[model samples]
Target: ESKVVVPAQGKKITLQNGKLNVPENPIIPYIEGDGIGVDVTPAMLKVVDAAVEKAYKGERKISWMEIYTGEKSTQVYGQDVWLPAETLDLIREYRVAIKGPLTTPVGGGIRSLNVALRQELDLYICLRPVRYYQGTPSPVKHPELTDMVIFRENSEDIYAGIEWKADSADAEKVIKFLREEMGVKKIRFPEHCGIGIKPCSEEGTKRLVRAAIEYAIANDRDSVTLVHKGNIMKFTEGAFKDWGYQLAREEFGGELIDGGPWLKVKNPNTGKEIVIKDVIADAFLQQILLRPAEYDVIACMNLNGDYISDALAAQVGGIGIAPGANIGDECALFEATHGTAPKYAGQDKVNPGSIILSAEMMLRHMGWTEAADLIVKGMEGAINAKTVTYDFERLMDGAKLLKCSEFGDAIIENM
Candidate 1:
């Protein structure tokens, strides 16, 4: 019932026609974000629209309604705090949305739009799919061989907002109890220290694993590798891995993968490989270092997934070209799995490959496989041809350089 709006970006993203259509009956609303969003958001929206347009042609298509949030919204509405309640209502009603970078609030500003939105929506699965884009600037070659989806439990783990600083009165009392009452006298801080409480319960771990396995089945992934530091912290991290295996076996007739040193599967199209098992978080990290190409999809709690995914992305050539999705059962939000690089905001020098690839993920999610496949092919061709960004230009020998927006055009042209 609400109206749809399209943005015009002048800096990094070239402004096209300023109108994008949507069904008045029911539109898939999205929040256009803050920061370098001026550069990248419009580009992503345009690309997604084009994919939907080309894919459906004369048939059904997405009704993309643009909503504003953060600084821009505050300016337009004359209230400079945070997300509008109305926007939250619409997102709840629509049950699906996507966004670009929201200028994350610093100390005195509003809380992070990203953190708020995810928590509000209870989207507990953070899926970052990292792969190499040929023309991006990076320090690595043979990066294209790495392609893996990382599913992190979006909520819980050490990031559950529970923390104590050593200087605080509460920390002093707790530390005093642990030291004088219990036999724990090793306190590392005369300086102020911040403590984060990690609570990875069976309920938390099982739910996370269920989400991962269901995703593997839905996406037709070969296996979901559980990455955990269980060997070190059993009750918390160890229970996470243990509960994850329980969920898999109970759900998919899945067994612990170690039968032939081979994982099993029954899909006719999949050439009959087994639904493989897991790797310990530490070993998983090492394995990525030694054997990244062998892994497929990784499922883990917040910390392990966060650390390993970033590391893997670095190995694959950094997050510039990485893409990700945060999902619930019926709703999924795909995004450029990188940060809002404020320094590169209007420079047009940073690679747009991550955002571009994120749109590719959205297309695939929407079942617009043709356009998705085309975009991917174009990206791959460009990469393999050594047509890349400044990062890759500096890193790879014989790498032909392409600017940020130019690469998008190349993808479109090649598409």
Candidate 2:
């Protein structure tokens, strides 16, 4: 069979929804991304369009527009930095996007474009959905048992990104203050006595937890576990717990799970009462190991989310087919949580499931469930058929490795 060759580029876009008066055509902004972006991104977009078209026909479509960043930007803007004011402006103006993986700069350069976007946009909520593709090769016997969503706080926590060199004046100033004002000693310093500062604030904590709770209720999930390392960092992590509960009780009055859509109260179906709960971060970790099926949704600060999501991905299999999304209340951006596989950049051998699934998420967000459901069914169907990417093929023995673009067409064909 001939491989699918998707279009290299597309025009700008907007969404307009007559029922909600939301421009069914809201402008979508984006960065094609760096490295694997050359292949995976275009493949991903092709899948997005195919899914939408097959699902919605002419009724709904995502308006895609180019917003440059990453390596492509370096060539266009003459700056090696991963971020630029132009990209930020587009994100702010459009309010929704998707991108393939990008490189993190080193030695006094741009930080991870991913991190910078979350911080600058006050994205607050990073939701990662890790589930199994049945036919896809996985490490565990029950790959399907790994289905779950993780909500990590986008900003704040130790990720606030502050630091001090051991020899720097700031480090000495802070060290002296800790010893003098707070009466502390034995500051754990490197050989150079360099220092790193972690600043996690309350405002950041609540917003993150708030997003988790809200998500739970909106999606009708049974529970949302708050994962954190509060046992050690009480002021920051522990307070995230306190504020999460406070917001649940104070804001919703026990209506929506967090600030999510109405969970109970005048239940849209029929009015009823409701309740919510919490959990420590570490214990939740053990529970995932002991009782992976019991949990439905989760919310945590950055470090915890990153650590836990990667672990969850590993249990089922690799990150190749993992799907993720970064969402704000009114706007959302979908993406593949995996890194840019430079080796597979143009090889046509990587998995597009991650981004394809992300597009499905974007579909559901658009209220295009019919189309979204079809693509999902098709993907799971294809996987169950053992038709998959190289990531899945290697582990499946005789299974064939579908090209990046082929995997997408398979999903569409199945749909």
Candidate 3:
């Protein structure tokens, strides 16, 4: 009776007045992404099912509804329909979803399927929580101290995809307008220079920062650090930092820490003071390597957040196991932070911890904290037992190598 996608056996998760009403057996939508998604997505589903079963003792369950996007959508719908309209409608209806890595389309109407989905859904908050799991091979001396939650502004900045390629007539027109009409002398070689617009609005900055602050208060975090390159890009990046501080003061009753600049807000839940501070993005890159323990929650613009999230992930190990989420007031989408390694698609040899932990995040978002905790415990136990996939096995000493599905089984065993 409906379109492409149909619900499975469970009830639809509803969002009412900014709260999710998840049923005992919720219909959760999932997208098996392109490439290695075939290998990792199933492993994630297996581990998540095991955790839920173990935690609930048959009291609750998830009925997964398969949805399509990226390459799979092209096959199911049409060659040109990478992102179908029905997929968006289904996800919005469900209110929560988990996905594996997606392949970015080349030379197309949408620059990136992932970005298109985020923008289309208005998933404005890119939430990346970076923490160390025990026994994971890391390059840092103390990866455990490098714990931070990055609240990246997902909607705007240069990631908005408002740009013209170099030497295009559109670029020339924009260059001419900027140089002649706007009295701009920055283009050294205006003939073949590419043009891009970076938009950082007050509404966008305030909403993102408010979410970060609310998260810090809810989680009892120490401080929320605003990372930006305000020293250079005064209008766009600099204004992002300014707007964040303004939001904290106006909305959260943030008071000046001592005199000015840095602010402090009292958490109503814990009564502890959460400091609001700023750091230059370049210095922050080094600080995360040197003084990572100083920072807790990071709020930043899109581009800086992209760089900082990956950089911070590397300190804990890498994106191979990093989990990410695109969150809004209504819907939330969790995904693996890594890319689609097409060469290793059907081999079932790559690590599946990224998507598995992404499901862990999804469970936590649904208020299934015990199930989420079991996943973390299982992952920590599996890694500490020295049973890992090729990625960690090649790095750590005396580690037994497991296949992708085998790793999921190992996590289930540990749970």
Candidate 4:
């Protein structure tokens, strides 16, 4: 009934009432992505396999089941099916999966396959941890101080895909309803204006912020900063900040800091104080560069999170090495944070660090801390040794440029 070939040696990962049940050798589904996925995916596989072997010594392993999406899916499941239903079902069955950067299909009914996967799976938390690896090329003075974890609201905001074309009948109808029934007159040019609705619910805001706070408490982080453009977008963005604080207080035992809007909650794990604060989005962006050490955990709306994630990644090298995960209560999908560099498709020239580090995140999520630590060590070792891809080679003096697969070998050698 399924198109995918399931590995016989691996046990399917199961989720029982929000708790993950991971076998020693789990059948981990993977999308080989488009473009440079050809080059980077194999490299990631090698590095992850090496790490797992060295860490567990045959006691544990991953049975990688290749699933399809993006251009590759079209080739496999015919030209019309970019994302097969089987791929989603496989991921759901597996409970955890990893992917390379996917190409956004052109001329859209679906705006992006990446976004489609997230919405379809209800993967509401876009988790990005930005930290400096030693000797990586960076634009900032002290990239090491820019360590922060971003918990992005992945479901709602403008990503909700509630928009109409500029001159469509749907747009005109919505405008008319706004002007007449809703008594709205803010449309500057209603004749051919496009319409977009930003829907931010308390349910969405609380869950995202709750995840950030729980992460902060669990990881012994000092604070969780709620970033928003609340000063301008009163009801939507402002309500996000309001609801975030309310959830922190009601659920996490947060109390007002200095008799004000900011809150603080005791970390149950370490018994340390974890500050809950809010910042205007623009100010937060500027402060991240000027005072990078002041922030630890960040929780924000979808658009703001998208902006902040890339910006933070830039401070410590780039998204070429930045890792991300889309997580829900039921499932998690770790992925390379960068895009498909179609120009470098089969050249084996681009950095494999993004997917490699994403796999590291996946390992850690699966409670394979030893393997994850080895990945971090290997990555830091590779960069510090001046062995890197062209992305880092072009920026760093005395760097040895390795091909994508070769870089994976370098990471393994260092490990």
Candidate 5:
């Protein structure tokens, strides 16, 4: 009686008082991502299933329901259909799901399925928490000090895919509108330039920043830095900073420090002062490299956030262990923040830590912190023991290399 096979045994998760009402055995949908997903996704699922079982001794459980997307969807649902409408609907029905990386075909095909899901579901906040796990190889001397959660505005800005190709008819029309109607002559070579509009709105900016500030207060983080390139791109990037500060003041009871700009708010739980600050995007990049500990929670626009997230990952080793989620008020999608390495696909050779850590985030989001903490303990213990995947083993001295699935098993064994 289902379009795709349902587990048919567990209860669906529901919401009450604006929080998830998770049953002992709640159905949680997962996408076995494209490419290396075949390796990592199963590893993630196996490790997580073990964590949950161990955490509650068979009390709490996750009834994993597999819903297809990416290449798997094309096979399951038939040709030319990359993402089925039914899959998205089921994800919404479940309210939360974890995914491995999907293959985004290069150079002008269908738009990114990930982006489409966020836009369709209004997943406005891209929450990526970057922290160092001890024994992991890193490029920085004090990778331990680089812990920070980036709150990226997911739905808008230059990443909105509003671009027109160079010398296209649409580009020509838009350039004409700007030069003749709007009188924008700053375009150096209007004839040769491609066109892409950057849109930042008060509504989008506030919701994202508000999430960042709220995260700071909830997590007892030190500060929330509004990162932007406001010095150059005034309206789009600059207004993000402005609107963020305004939201902090108007909605979150934030007040100015000395009758201007930077503000502070008391944590609702900790009673500690949470500072609200800003950093220009360029300086923020350098600051993250030079003084990572100074930054705790970062709020920024789409393009800057994307750049910052990957750069920060490099500082703490690589994105193989970095986990991310796109969240809205009602739903959330946790994902592996790295790309599908087609060369590594089906080889059981890539690190599953990213997707596994993503599952950790999912457990926490589901209010199963015990299971989440166990996942962390397992990951830490595995790495600390110098048993790791090729990505980390090659960088670490005297490290014992494990296959992708073996790494997952190591984590489970540690837990």
Candidate 6:
């Protein structure tokens, strides 16, 4: 019953000692994506293959396996089948995958395949790393200080889309029940008021923040900033901040710094002090532009994380070069953090850095540090030499613009 094809019946990446145990020739799955995916996916593959070969000589290789999703899934599976359970099961079985940008239907149908995948897989951590490469175009004066990784709550907050239509019978029934049974009178127009429920539970907030704190410990990050607008949304969002702080103190033995909310926890692994702090969401937004170096690992709920990651990405270079991953304990999916550029789909134009760097993240996750280091060095070298894509070329002076594929070649050439 599986339309999914495993091109390489090779060794699968497995979990060992709570981390990835990658073989010499691991079978890695990939979705070719939609629109610009048609162009950038192959470009990324070329660069990654080159990096692996260069890093390990003929000793190690990545056996690539193609998996279908998005439009390609529809063609392979059926017209109405946007996503097949087979594809999801295959990803779970393999344990690691990289995908290009996906389609999000407008005005109707499925809200987003991306969102659905995360929910189904329970990929709770949306990790986005933001840093500026020298010679990269940026709007901020001190782009170097913008290095930070965001741990976004992927499964909760307003992202769940729990809402009822304004005039629906369900909405009316809920409103009447609230007014009569709950003694609620805040509805300005009870007859036609739409209601959306935002549920942020202790378990969700604690798990997300725990991941951020643990990441800080593992990566030697200086601080973890919990960003929230708790002043307004007291119960849901505020409770998230409260629960997060409680987690640090109760579990990690974090001490309140100077008798205040700002806390310091000693990393048991390194004996280094990691500052745990909080900032109101709006103020934290401005602070990232004003003073980004002060923040390192960021922990926040779903909606706030979405806005913050994009804003920070723009400060360094733009989402075109932003790399991200959806991760849980069992499995992870690396992906471009940008959207599908439909018009630029098959043009071989647009920037492929996002997906390529995402592959870099994937490599690192698999403990392939040498190959991953090559990717970082190649990207840094390419940007430093001013060999960039259209997105950066137009903004930067004396930048040598290249096509999507050409940029991939440029990165390889630098490596």
Instruction: Please list all clashing residue pairs in model 6, or write none if there are none.
Output: none
Write the residue-wise lDDT of candidate 3 on 1-415 in tens digits.
2345555568988887656788999999999999999999999999999899999999999998899999998878878888889889888889999998888788755688888888789999999988888898788999989889999998899988899999988998898899999999877888878888999999999989998998898678999999999999999889999999999898998999778799999999899999999999999999999999999999999989999998888888866899999997778999987889999999999999989988988998888989999998999899989999999999889999899999999999988
Return the clash pairs for model 5, or none: none
The superposed Cα distance between candidate 1 and the true structure at residue 8, in angstroms, equals 21
RMSD (Cα, Å) of model 1: 6.6
TM-score of each: 0.82, 0.83, 0.91, 0.91, 0.91, 0.91
Worst 10 residues of 1 by lDDT: 7-16
Which parts of model 4 have CA positions greater than 4 angstroms off?
A: 104-111, 164-180, 185-194
Best by TM-score: 5
lDDT of 2: 0.69
**Compared with the true structure, what per-residue lDDT tens digits does model 1 show for residues 1-415?**
2233432311111112421122312355665566556666666666655655565674545566677677777675656646776777665555456777777667787777777777776778888877765554545556666778888987888888787876899877777776778867566763476566788878767777776665565467777777778788888877877787776657656644555322454444444443646677878877876676777778888988789878977786665667777775435566665667778777667666677777777665544567687777777776667777787677778987887766566556555
Runs of candidate 1 with Cα error greater than 4 angstroms are 1-26, 53-60, 105-107, 134-141, 176-195, 256-274, 329-331, 339-349, 386-403
Global Cα lDDT for candidate 4: 0.90
lDDT of 6 by residue, 1-415 (tens): 6755565446998887766778899999899999999999999999899999999997888888888878888888887677788878888888999999888656666879998888788899999988888888788788988779999998888888798999999998889999999999887888889988899999999999998998888777799999999999999888998999999999999999999998999988888999999999999988988888799999999999999998988888756788999998788999987789899999999889999999988997787878988988899889899998888888889999899999999999989
Compared with the true structure, the alpha-carbon lDDT of candidate 6 equals 0.88
**What are the per-residue Cα lDDT tens digits for candidate 5 across 1-415?**
2457778788988977766788889899899889999999999999999999999998977888998888888778776677888888998888999988897655665678898888888899999889888888888899989889999998888877799988899999999999999999798988878998899999999889888887787567899999999999999889999999888888889989988699998898889888899999999999998999999999999989999999999899857788999999878999988889999898999999988999998998887888998998999899999999998898889999999999999999889
TM-score of 6: 0.91
Candidate number that wins on TM-score, 1 or 3: 3
TM-score, cand. 3 vs. native:
0.91
Give per-residue CA lDDT, model 2, range 1-415, as digits (tens). Answer: 1111222343323434411123444455656777777777787777667776776676556666766677777776667745767676666555567877787766777767887777676677778877776666666666676667798887666666677777788878877888789787676652357666666776776777666655555555666666667788888777776776667667665555566532332223223343354557778777777778777677788888888898888877747677888876445778877788788788887887777788777666655667778878888887777778877777786786788788777776777
| TM-score, prediction 5 | 0.91
